[PDB]
Structure formats: C-alpha cells, structure tokens
Amino acid sequence: LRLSEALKACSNILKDISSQRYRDLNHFFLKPVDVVALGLHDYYDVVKKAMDLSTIKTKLESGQYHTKYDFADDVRLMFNNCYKYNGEDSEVARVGKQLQAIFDENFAKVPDDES
Ligand SMILES: CC(=O)N1c2ccc(-c3ccc(C(=O)O)cc3)cc2[C@H](Nc2ccc(Cl)cc2)C[C@@H]1C
Numbered sequence: 076l077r078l079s080e081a082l083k084a085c086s087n088i089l090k091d092i093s094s095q096r097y098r099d100l101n102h103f104f105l106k107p108v109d110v111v112a113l114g115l116h117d118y119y120d121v122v123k124k125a126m127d128l129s130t131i132k133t134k135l136e137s138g139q140y141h142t143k144y145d146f147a148d149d150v151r152l153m154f155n156n157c158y159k160y161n162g163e164d165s166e167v168a169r170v171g172k173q174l175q176a177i178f179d180e181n182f183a184k185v186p187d188d189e190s
Pocket residue numbers: 102103104108113115156157160161166167
C-alpha cells in the first residue's frame with residue numbers, strides 16, 4: 076500500500092499530532108472511547124460514529140482513505156464528537172480545540188490529491 080503524496084503528508088501530520096510532543100493535548104484522543112471505563116452516560120445516544128487517532132491511523136495505513144478529504148473528515152469527526160458530547164466548556168473539549176488548531180494549520184499545507 077503506497078499512499079499518494081497528499082496522504083503521505085497526512086500520515087506525517089497524524090504522526091505529529093499523535094506524538095509525545097503534544098501528549099497533554101492528545102492523550103484523550105489516542106484510543107477509542109470506552110464508555111464503561113470512562114463512566115459515560117448516553118454516549119452512543121449522542122455520537123453516531125466514534126473516532127480516535129488510532130483508528131484514523133489504521134484506516135490511513137490500510138488504504139481506506141481515497142483522498143486527503145476522507146482523512147480530514149475522520150479527524151473532524153473525532154473532534155466534533157468530543158465537542159458535542161462533552162460540551163465546549165469541558166476540559167477535554169478545550170484541549171481538543173488546541174489540538175485541532177494545530178491539525179488545521181498543518182492540513183492547510185497538504186498538496187493536491189492528484190500530485
Ligand atoms: C475524548 C472524549 O470525548 N472523552 C475521553 C476520552 C478518553 C479519556 C481518557 C483517555 C486516557 C486516559 C488514561 O490514559 O488514563 C484517561 C481518560 C477521557 C475522556 C473524557 N473524560 C475526561 C477527560 C478529561 C477530564 Cl479532566 C476528565 C474526564 C470523556 C470523553 C468521552
């Protein structure tokens with residue numbers, strides 16, 4: 076599975092946002108939400124499709140994203156699930172916003188899909 080130049084750039088961004096350098100922002104997003112471990116009420120009444128950084132990596136590296144936009148859709152899904160479930164004043168949403176801002180700045184530099 077050889078990725079396009081755009082999706083290789085996406086892989087590098089994903090690695091960067093998932094890295095130890097941002098651990099205080101990303102640790103909440105590394106692995107799937109586990110309703111039992113986290114004590115959550117009503118999570119899947121609010122969130123239709125869960126997403127997290129490990130799943131994004133699996134999907135990217137197994138060829139499930141055809142364009143950089145498919146990849147970005149799942150990054151945004153992950154963040155939006157967090158905001159909508161937890162509320163934007165929650166601690167986790169606040170760090171999410173910081174991580175998303177880093178993602179957005181870097182994703183704007185990814186080349187065209189056909190290059
Ligand atoms: C992303 C998201 O929306 N949620 C989420 C996901 C993972 C973890 C989590 C992840 C790893 C650990 C750990 O390494 O121990 C602990 C909690 C925690 C949460 C959120 N819980 C939480 C986050 C911050 C604070 Cl100060 C208190 C509670 C719940 C939410 C569903």
